[PDB]
């Protein structure tokens, strides 16, 4: 479809109904959206949980919303209100919305080292106390911010031990299940990883829940890549494709904004740098000020990124390509005017017998405060299973299915 | 006058060094010595401000960092806005300097001394908040058979825009002439005149 022009990621091109199908029954008067936000004092000893709830259907005077916060079996905070926002402008406010503020003393903070979660329950009910419907999510208290050139979680500078991961299974193709997700997360943590980059699209919704519970930082990425265009920004600099691109970013933020594990939004991958990127960068900073935005395209340090995020820049050697140079990482930090932190969105290409020179990145990451780590390329080899004449399975790569043209073994880049 | 005619850039330095004090800023943090220090800076600027070869003023050398330095820094910026001011004391990047100007910082290796660390020069440029250029006020100590590793500074100076070079220590050996019994001249260093205590050959650090 014309959506295919935006989906040129380096991976098997497959098709079909590859994630779950459900029916959902809601009442006619329903919760239609809710957002959770956490604000802190200077030393993280007091928090405010702010919940915004929106409803659809017929507004009545007797409707109420309650938000309660649970730690295990103990209720820790609670608030109730009728519908009706504060005045927003000259025409009034939202009659079909309400904001609760809940105070929490000495909250247990979420991080990848100690993933403490609370449970928020949101109830729509009548004044006499008949329940209409409930919704719920897991809440982690954490603050992500960029302060004086450093990316801080809960006031401390992060060191990202990350990997890029595709959704890939050698028998089932791009179909993901709970068992494989859990196997990946255990192996990642057993090997000292704390972070994963969703290369290069939103994941199955269960993935974010498991990263909340086990503790990994997530970079969540919009499904936009136009690598095969000449030049790379032919579509992303064209206002007629701004509608298509905006749906890919806005719907991702609206689905995933409540997960504590998501700490950074990404605008996509390898699409050059066009005016559509700057517009969408600004859209996210305005609807969700709580997470940084990153984007590698167009030379890794454009106005559409809060973080300098090169791919495959070297530690000591410059690669001075026209228009989009890859400075060495130590030099990049100190270019006249530069103040952002640097995290490699891809480094150390793990293709085959590889990772020579890996120690030299880790020596730099520990010596320089504004080098805060990176994401290895990548977690798992994308090979598929074929059968021979005797029915013996063997691992196949590009070209083994009569697909043409193809890029041969270049699909196998994993640590596993 | 000769640097104007032949073409050299000059850094002109106030006659203030209190290296032997404990701590180094005992006098330069004391308001009773602010009169004495101000005469040394103000009279130098009033004598030399018309020479085109002078491009940078320096507040002195190895005197720690005291409030008298910040006051005199501000005095020069106000009477002569046309030249930057530099000062190495107190860890090379205080509020009394327009230029980060370390002495003997290395290219790749940190030297993490308490209070006054010497970062490696590539790392220093990129410390959170740092925006000034870096010029070494002394590097590559030329004592005797020396200058090993000199090429590694010049490779860094050419690769990084904000590393803008430095001043070698130093031009000429400070040795003196003595005569033997036959009247033959020989080169003498500390201790050869019955001076005591003394610091021996440490006065000979030159390229010539
Ligand atoms: O394997 C090379 C690697 N280069 C960079 C891209 O972002 C990845 O998708 C992949 O194609
Ligand atoms: Mg690509």
What report would you give on this structure?
Chain B: This is Beta-galactosidase. Chain B: Keywords: Glycosidase, Hydrolase, Magnesium, Metal-binding, Plasmid, Sodium. The structure is cut from a larger assembly and holds 2 copies of chain A. Chain A has about 425 residues and is of the alpha/beta class. Chain A folds into 2 domains: about 30-140, Immunoglobulins (Immunoglobulin-like), CATH 2.60.40; about 145-415, TIM Barrel, CATH 3.20.20. The first copy, chain A, contains 6 helices and 19 strands. Chain A has helices at about 180-190, 205-215, 240-255, 275-285, 330, 360-365, and strands spanning about 30-40, 45-55, 65-70, 75-80, 95-105, 120-125, 130-140, 145, 150-155, 155, 160-165, 195-200, 215-220, 260-265, 295, 340-345, 370-375, 385, 395. In chain A, the strands form 5 sheets. In chain A, strands 15-14-13-12-11-17-16 form a 7-stranded parallel sheet. Chain A has a 4-stranded antiparallel sheet with strand order 4-3-6-7, with no helix packed on it. Chain A has a 3-stranded antiparallel sheet with strand order 1-2-5, with no helix packed on it. In chain A, helix 1 (about 180-190) runs parallel beside helix 2 and helix 3 (about 240-255) packs parallel to helix 4. The longest helix of chain A has 15 residues, at about 240-255. Chain A is globular. Chain A starts with about 30 loop residues before the first strand and ends in a 20-residue tail after the last strand. Chains A and B meet through loops of A and loops of B. (2R,3S,4R,5S)-2-(hydroxymethyl)piperidine-3,4,5-triol binds near residues 10, 199, 269, 311 and 377 of chain A.
